[PDB]
């Protein structure tokens, strides 16, 4: 039986690609409840890992919205291997304004993981007439789309780089590009720039490709 | 449960750049039910009501809803001059009519810089190679990118959406996949870009071994 209009809305978010691929980092799944009325502000949360109920989840303080509604957030810390092995995370939301609870289930994108191929491209000859040059990192053939990409030099993330969102390729895998902008003088002086990638299908979940003149 | 949703789309970038082509703003209404027999559209250009839009007949979807589209032909000059287009959707089950507005992004237009990049030496182990077209420093984000080789179009390409850069301009990349043999043979490939801030709204950059 479906809910009538004007009731709460539930959005379930996956952990960050980086958090799942580093044992030091803590990956978490996020259950966000919107359109929570003032008349019925209490939201109850029930979490399930492959159908088995858990209790470690924390409910964040309810944020007051400009549109006169409440945003209620539940944060569940997940085990790195549990998320990667494809375990289903169910968030159950109970509220007085609801006729029946809303249930959202999140899992790592199903499908054979595919190893990204990482390629660094120097600036086009035509760009060498400019004050700033572009160093390109092509990351392709990866699955799922969850990836972390960074341009760095001398152990510093570079101040001026941008990465495109992943794009679905014709073979069902994904690709993206990350554009690093540097002053031409730094490129002409032989400084080494590196594109660092983290993905579940890379050996040791990490690869680094470096480029220089 | 929440009824219809409206999505208002800009014209195709190539349509606004070629006088021979007809640019249109499209007001799409989804989640229209069998109990929504009428879907009325009111259109405004800079808040002034216009009457030239055409509604297409409702189209049933596989999720048992209908999709209702209204198309408004726009002048190339009006879109490019930043006129605002508003679509208002109503019927007797819409106590609050739905309004959406669209216009070309405000700011000084900037010329795209087009750069072709060969495959990385590392990619030459694979049977298929990537030819890259970097298009940067353009404004607004409306742009068209295609590939050609020996007069004919190359269609085995994928282009990223425009990305907002650190200086307020946009960039994108277009990736053309070719068999290594075609690249090793010395065949010339071309990346063509259509944008308002290019000569005759078009430019082309070639790439060969």
């Amino acid at each position, epitope marked *: *039986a479906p809910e*009538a*209009a004007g009731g709460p809305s539930v959005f379930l978010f996956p952990p960050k690609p980086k958090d799942t691929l580093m044992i030091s980092r803590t990956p978490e799944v996020t259950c966000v409840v919107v359109d929570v009325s003032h008349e019925d502000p209490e939201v109850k949360f029930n979490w399930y890992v492959d159908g088995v109920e858990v209790h470690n989840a924390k409910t964040k303080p309810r944020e007051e919205q400009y549109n006169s509604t409440y945003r209620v957030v539940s944060v569940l810390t997940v085990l790195h291997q549990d998320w990667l092995n494809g375990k289903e995370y169910k968030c159950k939301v109970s509220n007085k304004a609801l006729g029946a609870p809303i249930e959202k289930t999140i899992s790592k994108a199903k499908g054979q993981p595919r190893e990204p191929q990482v390629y660094t491209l120097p600036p086009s000859r035509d760009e060498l007439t400019k004050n700033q040059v572009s160093l390109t990192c092509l990351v392709k053939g990866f699955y799922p789309s969850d990836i972390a990409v960074e341009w760095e030099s001398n152990g510093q993330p570079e101040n001026n780089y941008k990465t495109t969102p992943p794009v679905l390729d014709s073979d069902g895998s994904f690709f993206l590009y990350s554009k690093l902008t540097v002053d031409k003088s730094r490129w002409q002086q032989g400084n080494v720039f590196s594109c660092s990638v983290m993905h579940e299908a890379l050996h040791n979940h990490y690869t680094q490709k470096s480029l220089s003149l | 449960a929440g009824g219809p949703s409206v999505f208002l789309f800009p014209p195709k970038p190539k349509d606004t750049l070629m006088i021979s082509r007809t640019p249109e703003v499209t007001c799409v209404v989804v989640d229209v039910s069998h109990e929504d027999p*009428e879907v009325k559209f009111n259109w405004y250009v800079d808040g002034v009501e216009v009457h030239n839009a055409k509604t297409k007949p409702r189209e049933e979807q596989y999720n048992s809803t209908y999709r209702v589209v209204s198309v408004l032909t726009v002048l190339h000059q009006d879109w490019l001059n930043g006129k605002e287009y508003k679509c208002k959707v109503s019927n*007797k*089950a819409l*106590g609050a*009519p739905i309004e959406k507005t669209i216009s070309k992004a405000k700011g000084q237009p900037r010329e795209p810089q087009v750069y072709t990049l060969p495959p990385s030496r590392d990619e030459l182990t694979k049977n298929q190679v990537s030819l890259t077209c970097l298009v940067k420093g353009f404004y607004p984000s409306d742009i068209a990118v295609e590939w050609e080789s020996n007069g004919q179009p190359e269609n085995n390409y994928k282009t990223t959406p425009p990305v907002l850069d650190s200086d307020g301009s946009f960039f994108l990349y277009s990736k053309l996949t070719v068999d290594k043999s075609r690249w090793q043979q010395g065949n010339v490939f071309s990346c063509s870009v259509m944008h308002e801030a290019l000569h005759n709204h078009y430019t082309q950059k070639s790439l060969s071994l």
Partner: antibody
Amino acid sequence: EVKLLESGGGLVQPGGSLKLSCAASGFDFSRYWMNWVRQAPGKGLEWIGEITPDSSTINYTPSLKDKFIISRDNAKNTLYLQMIKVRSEDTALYYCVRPYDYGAWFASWGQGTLVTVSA
Amino acid sequence: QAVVTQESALTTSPGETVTLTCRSSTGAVTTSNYANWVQEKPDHLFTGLIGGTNKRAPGVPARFSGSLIGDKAALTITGAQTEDEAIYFCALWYSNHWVFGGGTKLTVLG
């Protein structure tokens, strides 16, 4: 919370005129159509009319179109009903009614204001 | 103008299914009539239940549903509750005006 509060009711002489108000709060009043509906003693509901958010269209029960004038002032979050040359049959509770965003056109009702037409 | 007719009164019992109807004097009730249903409780407390033939207002229980049956509009209550005791009005849209029916008083037995 959606709130509609009618005012301006009371005693009016036959042949008299009266203007009712409906103060809205808890929502963006400028987004919605608004209705006026009445209920005379021992009778059912009778629609009076409605007004678009921008006031470009005002609809009325055909038989009542020369007896009532609907208007609104979005900046003041207020709906109005001008009643002119009232008769005994106009004695009734007058309700302002807001549709929900989608679906129910008579969703949110004020408590009503009683107009008594009497000498 | 057009006249809208409903049953004067109907009786049901807790857990039963009851159907209220709404007829148009102009002929068959269509989706273009955007049938509406309103519930009236004591102290003149009105709440809209349905609009656009079958769309429930926010907070309306799932036991209330709207539909069209051939030439009439209908409000079905599936698994009636004692709290459903009320007067139910229907309203139909006629191109430029709404017309309310006479209302149906619902008695819940037991």
